[PDB]
Structure formats: structure tokens, C-alpha cells
Ligand binder design. Structure first.
Ligand SMILES: [Cl-]
Length: 171
């Protein structure tokens, strides 16, 4: 069955940003009670606070469920928080699949960490006016470029939803 999914919002974001994606994954066979969206109290996106918070949240998810790994879907600065956690903290042995949506990924690294053991997908839109695609493209990820969708639109797009499902089941 699927790993628990942890969804990670960006600057000025919230857990409820992921309501569309949760409803989609539930319709595709994921269990609602194994879809987790963190709510950062720090809305500035600061890796210093949010990456350890993410680490602790995932450990609680692993401890509560008994799963060995989580998958992550991250939006915007949430992608940077996620890559900081994997690269600089403890996340490299805790994650199966990582899917970023307009992620501000190269603020942390140009290369997806341990991308032979962790499966990475980076989805981004040429109409994104908040995060440039050059920031989202990640060496060692499946980089998927689409058109016509806005930065927040990435959270409420049927095309993106299908790409997320592919990213969460990549081999
Ligand atoms: Cl935009």
C-alpha cells in the first residue's frame, strides 16, 4: 500500500492549501487518514524553523503509523524546506517519493539528494510568476514543465494532480 503522504506548504501558506490534492488522492485510492498536511506556525518559510518542524512531524507520523517511510508533496518554499530537511537534517532515510510543485528548490541545492534511493519529481509551470522554473528544476529529478497554470493554480489543477499521482508511484 501507499506510504503516508506529508504535504508541505510555502510562504504565507497553510495546511488547507492541500484540500484539492487530498480530495484527488482520496479519489485515486489513497486513504484520507494517511494524508497529512503540516501547518507551519512560521509563515515566513524560514528553513531554520520549518525544516526541524518538518522532521519532527514526520517522525510522529512514522511512530504513529509504523510505516518505514513517508512520501512528500511540497509547494513553493515548502520544496526548499523539504530539500533542506533531506540534505542537511535526517530526512534521507525517511522518504520514499518527493514531489515538488513550483518548488523553490535551488535555494537549497541543484541536485536532488540521494536520488538513486529517493524518487524525485519536480513539476513547474511557465506561467508561474512567483517561483522561476530555473529555481524548481532539480538535477536527478523527473522535471516536468507545463504551461498556463499559475503558482497557486498548481494546487487546484487536474493536470498537476495526475502528475502528482505519477510522482508518488514512480519506480
Ligand atoms: Cl503566478
Amino acid at each position: 500500500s501507499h506510504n503516508p503522504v506529508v504535504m508541505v506548504h510555502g510562504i504565507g501558506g497553510a495546511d488547507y492549501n492541500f484540500i484539492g490534492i487530498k480530495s484527488y488522492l482520496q479519489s485515486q485510492g489513497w486513504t484520507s487518514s494517511e494524508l497529512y498536511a503540516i501547518n507551519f506556525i512560521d509563515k515566513t518559510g524560514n528553513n531554520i524553523n520549518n525544516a526541524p518542524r518538518l522532521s519532527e512531524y514526520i517522525k510522529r507520523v512514522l511512530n504513529q503509523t509504523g510505516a518505514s517511510k513517508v512520501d512528500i508533496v511540497a509547494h513553493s518554499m515548502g520544496g526548499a524546506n523539504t530539500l533542506y530537511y533531506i540534505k542537511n537534517l535526517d530526512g534521507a532515510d525517511k522518504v520514499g517519493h518527493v514531489v515538488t510543485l513550483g518548488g523553490a528548490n535551488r535555494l537549497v541545492t541543484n541536485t536532488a539528494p540521494q536520488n538513486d534511493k529517493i524518487s524525485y519529481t519536480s513539476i513547474y509551470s511557465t506561467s508561474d510568476y512567483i517561483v522561476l522554473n530555473s529555481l524548481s528544476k532539480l538535477d536527478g529529478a523527473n522535471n516536468v514543465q507545463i504551461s498556463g497554470v499559475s503558482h497557486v493554480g498548481l494546487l487546484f489543477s487536474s493536470k498537476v494532480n495526475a502528475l502528482i499521482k505519477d510522482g508518488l508511484t514512480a519506480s
